């Protein structure tokens, strides 16, 4: 139930989102991740940004000194924030993740998002008109010192997330390139298929990995409340009749079946081990066709700040 990355190393294909909003209270992550461990998770997807690697890193250590697991079991993963792009801010910033952690590595290491903000101590450097600040930095250099980390060992994989394709050319054309991005993980999902891109990515073995695959948290921050909720869609739902199963299901096994790792992300015990549920049952040759025509180019993330970004993926 793994794929095997450009690198050598095999990540699990499906994986648990582990961001939830800071109105919930942190000691939830740490039990969730417990409980999606327990269900049959070995894929868990975190970033410094979610604030929580200290409570995931916690839960990851009590399942293995339960000894429900252990630590090559795992496949864990964080994320390099926009404002440690420059390259001498890489490296610290993956080291505190792993001491934050509790790890002396990590799975997979990503670029968290091309678009590059004001180096410092604060996630979202403001301004006084309430800017956000960007930050001008050449992402050649970031994935040098990205690679340095897979060397040093504190990466067993190095890749990106959010890069559109012209992107992902600038890493693949780089000269000098030592390791290629093992994957990019951005939004996919029914109404956000990103046929194009997967073509690319599975043209230069880079493996896509799909966040908000079951239409997102919907969070008012980012998502206009008038977009259509996702698991709501008659086709899923219609296919979620016919095999009996639920509209979540059907979204998680369609990104399978076309070779897409997918994240799941659930602070509901039932729901959790109701997603690992994904391997019992598969789709028809029609029923993904019948997804396929779902796609509307509807990303459920939309914010005026960052699209006036140079490094804004989307167009
Ligand atoms: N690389 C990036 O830039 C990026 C961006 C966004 C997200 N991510 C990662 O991808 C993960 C998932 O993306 P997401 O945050 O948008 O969440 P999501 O996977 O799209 O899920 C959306 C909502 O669906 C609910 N859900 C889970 N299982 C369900 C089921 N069987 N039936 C019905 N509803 C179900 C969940 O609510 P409940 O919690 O109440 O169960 C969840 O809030 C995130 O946690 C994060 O790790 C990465
Ligand atoms: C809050 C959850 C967080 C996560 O990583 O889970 C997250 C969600 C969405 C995005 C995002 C938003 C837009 Cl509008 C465009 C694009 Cl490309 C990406 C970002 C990012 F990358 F901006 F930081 C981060």
């Given at each position: 139930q793994c794929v095997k990355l450009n690198d050598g190393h095999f990540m699990p294909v499906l994986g648990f989102g582990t961001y939830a909003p800071p109105?919930?209270?942190?000691s939830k992550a740490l039990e969730v991740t417990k409980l999606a461990i327990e269900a049959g998770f070995r894929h868990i997807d975190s970033a410094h940004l979610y604030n929580n690697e200290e409570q995931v890193g916690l839960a990851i250590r009590s399942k293995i000194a339960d000894g429900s697991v252990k630590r090559e079991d795992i496949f864990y993963t964080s994320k390099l924030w926009s404002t440690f792009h420059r390259p001498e801010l890489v490296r610290p910033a993956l080291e505190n993740s792993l001491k934050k952690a509790q790890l002396?590595?990590?799975d997979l290491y990503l670029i968290h998002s091309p678009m590059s903000l004001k180096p410092?101590?604060?996630?979202?450097?403001?301004?006084?008109?309430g800017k956000v600040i960007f930050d001008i930095v050449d992402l050649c250099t970031t994935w040098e010192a990205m690679e340095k980390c897979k060397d040093a060992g504190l990466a067993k994989s190095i890749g990106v997330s959010n890069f559109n394709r012209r992107q992902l050319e600038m890493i693949l054309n780089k000269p000098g390139l030592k390791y290629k991005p093992v994957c990019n993980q951005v939004e996919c999902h029914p109404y956000f298929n990103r046929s194009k891109l997967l073509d690319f990515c599975k043209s230069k073995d880079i493996v896509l990995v799909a966040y908000s695959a079951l239409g997102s948290q919907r969070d008012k921050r980012w998502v206009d409340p008038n977009s259509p909720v996702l698991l709501e869609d008659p086709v899923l739902c219609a296919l979620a009749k016919k095999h009996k199963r639920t509209p979540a299901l059907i979204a998680l096994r369609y990104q399978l079946q076309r070779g897409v790792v997918v994240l799941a992300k659930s602070y509901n015990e039932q729901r959790i081990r109701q997603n690992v549920q994904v391997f019992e049952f598969q789709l028809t040759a029609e029923d993904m066709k019948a997804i396929d025509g779902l796609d509307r180019n509807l990303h459920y993330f939309n914010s005026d700040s960052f699209a006036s970004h140079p490094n804004y993926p989307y167009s």
């Open positions: 109105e919930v209270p942190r002396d590595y990590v410092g101590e604060e996630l979202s450097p403001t301004d006084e008109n």
